[PDB]
Curated annotation (Swiss-Prot):
This is Phosphatidylinositol 3,4,5-trisphosphate 5-phosphatase 1. Phosphatidylinositol (PtdIns) phosphatase that specifically hydrolyzes the 5-phosphate of phosphatidylinositol-3,4,5-trisphosphate (PtdIns(3,4,5)P3) to produce PtdIns(3,4)P2, thereby negatively regulating the PI3K (phosphoinositide 3-kinase) pathways. Able also to hydrolyzes the 5-phosphate of phosphatidylinositol-4,5-bisphosphate (PtdIns(4,5)P3) and inositol 1,3,4,5-tetrakisphosphate. Acts as a negative regulator of B-cell antigen receptor signaling. The chain holds residues 398 to 857 of 1189 of the full protein. One of its GO terms (biological process) is negative regulation of signal transduction. The SH2 domain interacts with tyrosine phosphorylated forms of proteins such as SHC1 or PTPN11/SHP-2. It competes with that of GRB2 for binding to phosphorylated SHC1 to inhibit the Ras pathway. It is also required for tyrosine phosphorylation. Tyrosine phosphorylated by the members of the SRC family after exposure to a diverse array of extracellular stimuli such as cytokines, growth factors, antibodies, chemokines, integrin ligands and hypertonic and oxidative stress. Phosphorylated upon IgG receptor FCGR2B-binding. Keywords: Apoptosis, Cell membrane, Cytoplasm, Cytoskeleton, Hydrolase, Immunity, Lipid metabolism, Membrane, Phosphoprotein, Repeat, SH2 domain, SH3-binding.
Length: 460
């Protein structure tokens, strides 16, 4: 029975509004309703992995697991295995997989982050799960960010705290946060970004939604505008939104947006908004295609509608050769020519590089680079031809061309990372000098760039 080179992943996000769900929620798992929906001809085809994020979830883990499993069983006639479940307050993540994947899934991690201080610590934050699927690392984050139209900066701060402190994936990847630890990272939840239009325009917005004319609303969506200005979710992708705003509905219908200020809202307006979102980030030149992104129309227990997204994702096999794992393959090497880092830092320490990859026995430390002043005020760290030759565990090109090298640039003085990035080994040619590039981030903010040339030798 051959190992897969693709899997499909279902991502669901639903703020349940502290109410139990209705008896049928199958439309969510089938990607049916509004937006980019799944073809009817696929209804019996199970996804390989289902990841369910809830917020304001009033159910026990047991109660929710029973509803989810019985839902998937009805759709697919498959009894799904529970990979992981993790809850922080009323924020929950469930990962379910087809039973045939049980012995493909390992290194299962869960964590949570509580956002805010004092006043603002006690119900917002994130949960996450990571695991390996054969040779591919998968991470999943469900976050409930700060509410309120005038708190987009707080949401952006919540995002930075979550990606700094959520402890998922391979702990040996010590310089890297969750935005570099996974082949594929999915980040979803009630992110709570709003449509920033005046309160007086509420009925105009409702009109626009009834016409299915979303363009003038999306141009004021705080998550789209913050992402454009590089304030949040740098280097993440989101599928185009073609469904109505998922918040705030009167319960038991979808015919009415409840936007007016009430004692129950803290006298805040809730203009119709796309609070409920799915984003992703995959390593360079790995296959990932969004195949659905939408909301259900028939689940009306909450003031939010459920959101679904599905993805095709490239995966690789757990490779063994006569040499690696447990030794190098002298027939393989990775060389770096004319490399330099450009950093936004005002500091003057020496810097060195660390190379981390599951194609190496352990990470590799470079010598210090030579600092020069760039012509526009920047720090340029030149490595020239001085970077070590990397010795992969397996030289087979069917393995090596599917790998990635994570790069951290670190201060000699403090050993703290100033910048992290990733290079694909999916090259146009082997034994050939080719340009490489990655942006560098730290705490998920742009800090610089790394560029140069690579030369990859495989056994072929
Ligand atoms: C051995 N660990 C259990 C939790 C497990 C369950 C499902 C799966 F796909 C992989 C592992
Ligand atoms: C990450 N891709 C960039 C081009 C982008 C930024 C904001 C946005 F709303 C859509 C795309």
């Amino acid at each position: 029975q051959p190992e897969p080179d693709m899997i499909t992943i279902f991502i669901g996000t639903w703020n349940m509004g502290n109410a139990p769900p209705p008896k049928k929620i199958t439309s969510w798992f089938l990607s049916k309703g509004q937006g980019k929906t799944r073809d009817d001809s696929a209804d019996y085809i199970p996804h390989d992995i289902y990841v369910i994020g809830t917020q304001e979830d009033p159910l026990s883990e047991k109660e929710w697991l029973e509803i989810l499993k019985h839902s998937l069983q009805e759709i697919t006639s498959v009894t799904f295995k529970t990979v992981a479940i993790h809850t922080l307050w009323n924020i929950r993540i469930v990962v379910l997989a087809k039973p045939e994947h049980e012995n493909r899934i390992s290194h299962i991690c869960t964590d949570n982050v509580k956002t805010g201080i004092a006043n603002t610590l006690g119900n917002k934050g994130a949960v996450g799960v990571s695991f390996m699927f054969n040779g591919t690392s998968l991470g999943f984050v469900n976050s409930h960010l700060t509410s309120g139209s005038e708190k987009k900066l707080r949401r952006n701060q919540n995002y930075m705290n979550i990606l700094r402190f959520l402890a998922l994936g391979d702990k040996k990847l010590s310089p890297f946060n969750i935005t570099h630890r996974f082949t594929h990272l999915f980040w979803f939840g009630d992110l709570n970004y709003r449509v920033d239009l005046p309160t007086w325009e509420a009925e105009t917005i409702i009109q626009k939604i009834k016409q299915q004319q979303y363009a003038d609303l999306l141009s004021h969506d705080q998550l789209l505008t913050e992402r454009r200005e590089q304030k949040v979710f740098l280097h993440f992708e989101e599928e185009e939104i073609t469904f109505a705003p998922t918040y705030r509905f009167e319960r038991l219908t979808r015919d009415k947006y409840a936007y007016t200020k009430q004692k129950a809202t803290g006298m805040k307006y809730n203009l119709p908004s796309w609070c409920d979102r799915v984003l992703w980030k995959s390593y360079p030149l790995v296959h990932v295609v969004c195949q659905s992104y939408g909301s259900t129309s028939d689940i009306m227990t909450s003031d939010h509608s459920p959101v679904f997204a599905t993805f095709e994702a490239g995966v690789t096999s757990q490779f063994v050769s006569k040499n690696g794992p447990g030794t190098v393959d002298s027939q393989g090497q990775i060389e770096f020519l004319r490399c330099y880092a450009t950093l936004k830092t005002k500091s003057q320490t020496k810097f060195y590089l660390e190379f981390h990859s599951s194609c190496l026995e352990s990470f590799v430390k470079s010598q210090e680079g030579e600092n020069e002043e760039g012509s526009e005020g920047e720090l340029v760290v030149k490595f020239g031809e001085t970077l070590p030759k990397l010795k992969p565990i397996i030289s087979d090109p069917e393995y090596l061309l599917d790998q990635h090298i994570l790069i951290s640039i670190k201060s000699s003085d403090s050993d703290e990372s100033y910048g992290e990035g990733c290079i694909a080994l999916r090259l146009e040619a082997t034994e050939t000098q080719l340009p490489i590039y990655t942006p560098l981030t730290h705490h998920g903010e742009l800090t610089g760039h790394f560029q140069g040339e690579i030369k990859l030798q495989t056994s072929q």
